[PDB]
Structures are given as C-alpha cells and as structure tokens.
Structure 1
Amino acid sequence: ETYVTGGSVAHSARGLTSLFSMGAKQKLQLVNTNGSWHINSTALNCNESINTGFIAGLFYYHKFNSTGCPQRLSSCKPIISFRQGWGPLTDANITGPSDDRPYCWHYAPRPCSVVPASSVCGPVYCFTPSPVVVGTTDIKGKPTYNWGENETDVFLLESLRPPSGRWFGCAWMNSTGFLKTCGAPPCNIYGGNETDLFCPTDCFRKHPEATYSRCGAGPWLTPRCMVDYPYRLWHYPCTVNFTLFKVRMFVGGFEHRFTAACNWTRGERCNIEDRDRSEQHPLLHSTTELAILPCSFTPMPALSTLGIHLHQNIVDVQYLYGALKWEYVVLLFLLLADARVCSCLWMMLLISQAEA
C-alpha cells in the first residue's frame, strides 16, 4: 500500500473557530463564464491587508464548493501525455496568444514585464523558491509614463534567472479574478495526438537534465508538487486537497526552506516510473531519513555508497546507510616479498589514487 509518513495536511487545521462561522464574509467559489471557470471576483473583497487575508485563508478549509473543479482540471494533462525530449536545452520564446489555461502545472508563462496595479486583486507573489510579496511604486513619477490612464503604483518584476535575476516567476489575479502569471523563459527540449511540452519546471522524466534551477520558472517544482504560500488557495482553487511537506532547496549558493503541497492520495501506483527529480537537502541532517516529496527523489547519493534507496510502500522517505582489501593485500604481499622499491611505488600509487 502506497502511503506517506511525514505528510502534513491542513484540511482541518481548525477548531471552534466559529467567531466568523461563515467564510469571514469573503466567499470564495468558482463560477463559469462563457465556458471558462475562474473565481467569482464580484464579492471577493480585494483591498485587504496582509493580516486580514491571512485570517481569511486561515478560515478557508471546509466551505469549498469544489463543484466545477474536475471539469476545469480536464484541461490539464499528466506528464505522460507529452512527447520525449533530447539534446541540449534552449530558451523558449513565448509569444502571441496563450490559449492554455495558466493554472495547469505545465503552463509556459511570458517574461515578467511591468503591470498596472489597477488590474490586480490581492497581493502579487514572486517565487524565488521561498515565496515573497512584491509591492508597488507610483508610475506617474517615473518615466514609465502611463501604460493606462491616471493609474498609479504599477508592479514591476523584470527579473532574470534567480542565480542572476531576482525570482523565477510571479503570480496574481487580474481585476476580473482570472489567474495571471509570468516568469523566466522555460526550456525548449526539441530544438537542440500528443503535444510538445515547453517544460516550465523540473521535467525530469521527459528530459534528463532539465532541472528546476535551469528550467523551472514559476510555482511548480514537480508536475506533482508545488511550493506553498498564504494565498495558494487564493490563486489556485483546485489544489485545496493537497498535503504539505518540508523542503530545503539550496538554490544559487544560498539556503532556501519552505513548505510544499502535492497531488498525493493514498494508494497511487508509484512503482518506479512515477518518480521525479527534485534537489532536496537534509533538514535535520541526521537519522539517515530524508523527508522528500512523494513520488520523487533527490540527487544526493547515500553516505557509504551511491544508488538511491527508496521504500516500496512509503515514497516520502529517502534512505541513507545502504575498504581497498585488494590493494591492501597486494601491498602486504609486496612487503612480505620485501621489494621496498616496489613497496614505495605502491605506497605512492595508493596516495595518488587510493588515499586521494
């Protein structure tokens, strides 16, 4: 039976919180719009503070009328559906209309340019692996000079890859409540019935070295897991059901720690092919057990030896705790032979190779 150990779930992180007792009055529910399913932005208070939004997200665990969520998610595809990849990576060129629904894990965004705050509701979140909030500054002052009309305090992101730039990608909702995100260019894996995946994240199974650091640009680490943040339920509705995990990234030399949610349910077939690469780092750095994303692994070989050791029935666990007898025997035989010159040569060879 496939299950987890360290999986923390926030579906009922509440008790006797009936002081509000009803959605804290900012009802969050999906509606259809000419065959399109987004959040009902009408009631959906917009100009709140960070603490008010934090309380609102705190009270949202149960009242989710997830009715149209399946048919909305029908647009998304599993990683299997795409075609193979090969060759050296290239940087894609996202242009023209993007008919794809952005909430899918594999949505290629446009480069993060300027954006007027007159058409955004809620905070805007950039996703240097540890999520961050982005503020504003008045457009009327700077020569940015009126992308719209009498607007003020436009957001600007304009970031390169986080090792050089500031963040991978950022997300928000526009005024009508539709998800809108941008990010760094993703990886094309073909230039050098199915569809060509543009790999906005760690598409390990479809391309070997397309790691998150090189390719990923956005909230998605694996096609199964994502980085959590206070407005995660805000921006992405359907991912309510997810379970949290502890993550240590270590991107760009610096250290990054945060939480991650996942498309995980007990009993999912996860034999060997449903494993995705993700660069983790030890949290406690001991006990030889690593809490890793479910249906995943990390490229850190074990202590004594190499070869990733993973448990059949629990996927979140990464195992550790899985010598030159020949050379020592040869050296001892040489010593018995008393060939000191040969003994000295063997000692030098061991120092160069065995000892080094």
Structure 2
Amino acid sequence: HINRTALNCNDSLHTGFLAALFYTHKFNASGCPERMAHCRPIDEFAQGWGPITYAQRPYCWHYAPRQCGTIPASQVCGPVYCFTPSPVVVGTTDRFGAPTYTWGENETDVLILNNTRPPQGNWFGCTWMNSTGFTKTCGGPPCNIGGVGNNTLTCPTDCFRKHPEATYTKCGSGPWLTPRCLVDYPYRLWHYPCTVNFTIFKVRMYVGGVEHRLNAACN
C-alpha cells in the first residue's frame, strides 16, 4: 500500500523540504511571522446573512479552495490526505479508478480526489504537496454567506459567528475545522509547517449523526 503514494518529488527550488518526508524536527520557522500575517482573523470579515450558496496561501484558514477533481500523479509528492473530517489517505489509481502500485511513475497514474461533502459524500477536502514543495489543497466547494463590503468571507470552514448556518457540515472544505483548528494528521507539520506550535486537543465531531473522534491542532 505504501507503493500507492505518488512520489514525484524534485527540490529544484533548493529548500530541503524533502528532508521532512524522513527526518523530524527540522523546520525553520523564521519566515512564519511574515506569512501568517496574511491570514486575517474571522472578526475582520463581514457579517453574512440570507441563504447560503456555493462559490492563494493555503496556510490561511480562510483560503477558499476549488472543488476536488482528478490530478495527475506526476505533480504529487507524498501522501494525499482527505478529511471526512477524519484524516484518510488517497492513493494512486489509473484513470478508471483501479488502484495502482508504481509510486505514481506512470503517466496514466492519477489521484482521484473528486469530493462530495459527507454525509452523502466521501470527504470535505484534501491536502497534499506538489512536486516542488508547494502545499496544495482542494475541497468544498466553499460557501458564499452573503454580506456587504470588501472584507466579505467565502467561508471554507465553520464560520458560524458570521453566518449561523455556516457550520463545518455546511461549509467545511478541508482540514480546517474552525478558523483556529485544523485536523491533526501525520503530515500536518509538512503541509502546514507554520502550525508547529499549535496545541493538540481531543475533539468530537458529528456529521449527519456519525461521530468522528479526532485530534485537532489549535492556536
């Protein structure tokens, strides 16, 4: 099953990011302040109302992704994680859905991430690393919660302060459970390396009556 990991990595920007696929406690955080300053806390966004409809910097909770589709294995480096909100791994297949076991070397190899929100679907969103060390994420589609102004929020998580119906079941689009919490999982410190000092909490989540017991990392 490890053979179903797409491992098409190439550190051509000379970051050393491939190290963290193997060794632990290696992340340089000096650049996190300047990057995390681009994520606005929920209070700065505009209060929404009316009916909800469905619409970079993937380390911000408010990053509004596109729906998940099918991606070529050649652009994937390491395991793909999707969130139900519980974390699950999606491996390589050919274009027709049959699991493949060649580490994603074949050009016909894909990662089929096509998502429908549970309960009638598979998962809320997926996260993974592309070949040169950029974190990618997809899911949702996120929620248009209305509101006026230039600080209007396309909600991808539980944003209920800004719209009472913008819950994670309604709007969740990936691993961010709230604007402060994201699903813990064995590669979070790689995909979201600036969450290194987040605190790990035991939480419980309900999705159409199904209980999810999971660890969340929060700030």
- Taking structure 1 as the reference length, the TM-score comes to 0.52
Aligned-partner Cα distance in 2 for 1:255–1:189: 26
Residues 261 and 176 of structure 1, relative CA distance in 2, 3 Å threshold:
same
Q: Which residue of structure 1 lines up, in the alignment, with residue 6 of structure 2?
A: none
> Is the 8 Å Cα contact of residues 140 and 152 (structure 1) preserved in structure 2?
no
State yes or no: 1:182 paired with 2:156: no
Q: How does 1:135-214 map to 2 (within 5 A)?
A: 135-139=91-95, 151-190=107-146, 194-214=150-170
Q: Paired residue for 2:46, among 73, 83, 107? A: 83
1:236 equivalent among 158, 182, 192: 192
Pair 211,140 (structure 1): closer, same or farther in 2 beyond 3 Å? closer
CA positional deviation for 1:250? 2.3
Q: RCO (CA 8 Å, sep 6+): is it higher in 1 or 2?
A: 2
Gaps of 5+ in 2: 1-12, 99-104
Give, in angstroms, the shift of residue 253 of structure 1.
Answer: 2.3
User: What is the CA distance between 1:190 and its match in structure 2?
Assistant: 1.1
Which one has the largest radius of gyration?
Answer: 1
RMSD over aligned CA atoms reads 2.4
- Cα deviation digits, residues 70-120 of structure 1 (max 9, x gap): 11112111111111111111111xxxxxxx312110111111000011111
CA distance in 2, matches of 1:65, 1:91: 37
What's 1:106 paired with? 62
1:74 maps to what in 2?
37
Q: Is the contact made by 2:92 and 2:110 (CA closer than 8 Å) also made in structure 1?
A: yes
Q: State the match for 1:262 in structure 2.
A: 218
Higher strand share: 2
Task: Identify the residue that residue 3 of structure 2 maps to in structure 1.
Answer: none
- What is the match of residue 317 of structure 1? none
CA contact (8 A) 2:17 2:133 kept: no
Structure 1 residue 252: Cα displacement = 2.3
- Give the counterpart letter for 1:71 in structure 2: E
Give % identity.
Answer: 71
**What is the alpha-carbon distance in structure 1 between the residues aligned to residue 92 and residue 40 of structure 2?**
35
- In 2, Cα distance between the equivalents of 1:165 and 1:255? 16
| Unaligned segments of structure 1, at least 5 residues | 1-32, 34-38, 93-99, 143-148, 264-356
Which residue pairs with 2:90 in the alignment?
134
Q: Measured at CA, do residues 227 and 150 of structure 1 come closer, stay the same or move farther in structure 2, by a change above 3 Å?
A: closer
Letter of the structure 1 residue corresponding to residue 197 of structure 2: N
User: After the TM superposition, which parts of structure 1 deviate over 3 Å for at least 4 consecutive aligned residues?
Assistant: 139-142
TM-score by length of 2: 0.83
Q: 1:137 to 1:242 in 2, by over 3 A?
A: same
